[model samples]
Target: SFSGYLKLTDNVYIKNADIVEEAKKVKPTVVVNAANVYLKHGGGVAGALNKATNNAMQVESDDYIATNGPLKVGGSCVLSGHNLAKHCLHVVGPNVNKGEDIQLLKSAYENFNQHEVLLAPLLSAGIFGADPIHSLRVCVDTVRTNVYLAVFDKNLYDKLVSSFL
Candidate 1:
């Protein structure tokens, strides 16, 4: 396991931990799923999270889609966080230009503030192919009050480590 932290405001912090496979242990808070607008939690961290929560999240996601239509850029939907948390905020990130991407992700991160102690994955930085550095930049700049960006893999860990420097 990787361990490192940077402190900012007393009430807020950014922790980079290898919580990808350790999702079960990191409970009692919200988990932000970086979802495709389709809410298909079939693969990647989303898949892992889906499995951890017994596919109930995907089932709820399917309900969210059928009821509300697909989530657009920076749009988010809430679902049961299950045993892992009180709520799960599944947010959509963009596949657009750098400036546009930052705005969308910034908005996405800001929207995640609806709950307490969020276990935030580095959303859209992978699979969706958003730049990790840029994603971290937005995370660092926009985070506050118990929002932690969970680094699920080594490359993302490096990106998390290489970031805030």
Candidate 2:
């Protein structure tokens, strides 16, 4: 059974558990979703959130960035109307097999810094084809707040702990 928190840096944390359940408790100021340029809530964490909120994520996210066109890699959009948190940050990560991983990750975190608590999934790892560990390292190295990287896969969680902690 996975429990406890692994502090990656000064304020960064990695946890092997249910992302949704943990978010409910932390009530992070911002919850980041690894999204596509189109802001489609299809698979991975985004899909789960979309279902959980009854398409609220898609509706609000589209309205938030409607005038901006497709979101660029690393670009983000702050959305509302979701019960998960105060805000939802939809970040466009690299495509399944292209683009610079680190640059995109940096851009995503660069969107907001004043957040007290931030929750993120393994960006670019699900449906984006980036290595989980590499993507996580970028988040840990980039985010300036007390961020939590939630992992559902046991192997990936173990890898994160071994590589960083």
Candidate 3:
């Protein structure tokens, strides 16, 4: 659905292998902390979302979960390891030294709900970098636990929202 002229583009779809390959090329840092991630719904090995989640976990460990077949609602998981995030995280989003931050958690929840994909900016901010906290405040100020998102352009976002509502 489009919001304020937001529209889906033909370039929206991207291959996971491609993204992983690019991440490998960047060869970033490694750390541990809360993470916000981007995920493709129903995209997993064995043509099943669970299969994909399993595949993702094999490379590294983090909190992750994939959409379930038929129902396809939000899901989550937790992971741990060093190499797994070499590309996907290493460079940012680790507040392990500072402990948990409310902003990161809030931003992660918002991103997970909005795009059905994890928030990137918060993750890019290195957990304690301040971006997640800022985004978290925005989420808290603008939304309630049961807040509703508008489906101005198309019916997709509304359909997703309806699943939870």
Candidate 4:
């Protein structure tokens, strides 16, 4: 298990580790799900989270975004259902085609600063095919709260460590 941290500020830190394992260790108050505009939790981290919470992830995700209308690339929605955490922040990130939209990716992290403790994955880096290095940089630059970043890809993890060095 690769795990490392880089302190960006007194209260903020960037972590490179297995997200699910970090969830157990941190017991975060919030988990930021890099989601699609359609609230689909069928693959990538979303799918794993769905399984972890016994399918409640999908239900909560739908409930969160359904009432507020469609979630755009730079938008987010808060959800609650299973006991995975106190809250779940569903952040809609760009797909592979729009993966180069750094501002939108940064906006997702901006929404997370309000939480006391959070665990988030590399936004859009999985199924969406966003460049992991760029995504990690945006996350490191934008976050302002205590955050645990669970990065599953080894290459991404190495890149994160190298960035700190």
Candidate 5:
């Protein structure tokens, strides 16, 4: 929900609190020397903005950008593509009953560009309905030969990127 470049001191610290308590004390952070920043809720496709975007928080793809914490996922929109926003949000909207899968896939493809970092929550076939092996197949088949980072649940972390050895 929030998006902007940041430079923090090494020793900065934050304490955790319950959701209600934190909600009452919420405040924004300040950043410097950044431009082309775009923040929106509901994935910018529908008027249903994410809570973080609603609250004016800056986000980067490095952050999980999830539907629950940080970014709310229930907003009615589809986030995909190579657009140059510091962060891009995606949602599964109701318009799909009319046949919009291509739009969604195109948007998804367009939201990405060569060498951009992508921080995702999981590669679970359960959550996103995307099979880990098949999705990686697409990455291998399509994605440019540039290095990027993808964050995932522990299980997926082991399957795709690395091993103890």
Candidate 6:
């Protein structure tokens, strides 16, 4: 899925591939979904993944929300990854209304430590408006585990590749 696999750290990689697709490629332990507060499968990564799974994720998300109470920024829910991975981590990303702190975003990333292999997207970088490169740096800095940082846009992928050196 990537143009080239560029190493960020010992095991971390930045790739020019869609995470929705990369999860399939890796036989991942878990797939990270940059999810909304309500866990709806709308735009960005959530929409793409839900569409790929034929909306099963939407049903799971609804069940999760019903079982658990309300979810705020940095909250997470785990569900089936469908055909993508064994498990899916749905994390709430910080938007402008949440004050845009790096810690909250990092908190979302850190929660995935239990899983050995993770296919990640730059959480909050899309519809939530977090800076992609900056998000990549934060993702690279935190989360000391096996992770694939999947990027969809070629320009942004080049930017990540440039920053790797």
Error of 2 at 17 (Å): 2.0
lDDT of 2 by residue, 9-44 (tens): 897788886666666666667887878888888988
Query: How many angstroms is residue 135 displaced in model 3 relative to the true structure, after the best TM-score fit?
Result: 10
lDDT scores in order:
0.70, 0.75, 0.29, 0.72, 0.28, 0.80
Off by over 4 Å in 5: 1-85, 89-107, 114-126, 145-147, 162-165
lDDT of 5 by residue, 17-132 (tens): 22112222332111110011122222222221233334333343224345434322222122322222343334232123233332232223323332233322211122334444
Ranking by lDDT: 6, 2, 4, 1, 3, 5
Worst 10 residues of 6 by lDDT: 94-103
Scored against the true structure, residue 1 in model 1 reaches a CA lDDT of 20
Candidate 6 residue pairs in backbone clash: none
Between prediction 1 and prediction 5, the one with superior TM-score is 1
The positional error of residue 112 in candidate 4, measured at the CA in angstroms, is 1.3
Model 1, 61-153: lDDT tens digits are 898889988987888888888766777788887755333455688887777666656777776776777877777767666666476666666
For residue 158, model 1's alpha carbon misses the true position, in angstroms, by 3.0
- Alpha-carbon runs more than 4 Å astray in model 2: 1-3, 98-102, 112-114
Candidate 1's error at 57, in angstroms? 1.4
Per-candidate TM-score against the hidden true structure:
0.81, 0.86, 0.22, 0.82, 0.34, 0.89
Residue pairs in clash, model 4? none
Which ten contiguous residues of candidate 2 have the minimum total lDDT? Answer: 95-104
Which TM-score value belongs to model 4?
Answer: 0.82
Put down candidate 4 lDDT per residue, 1-165, tens digits, no spaces: 224666655654566566656665555678777777778888888787777788888876677667766788877877862556667788877776654465677887788777866778878787878777787677767876777777777776767667752
Q: How far out, in Å, is residue 53 in model 3?
A: 10
* Highest-TM-score candidate: 6
Off by over 4 Å in 3: 1-18, 30-84, 87-106, 109-165
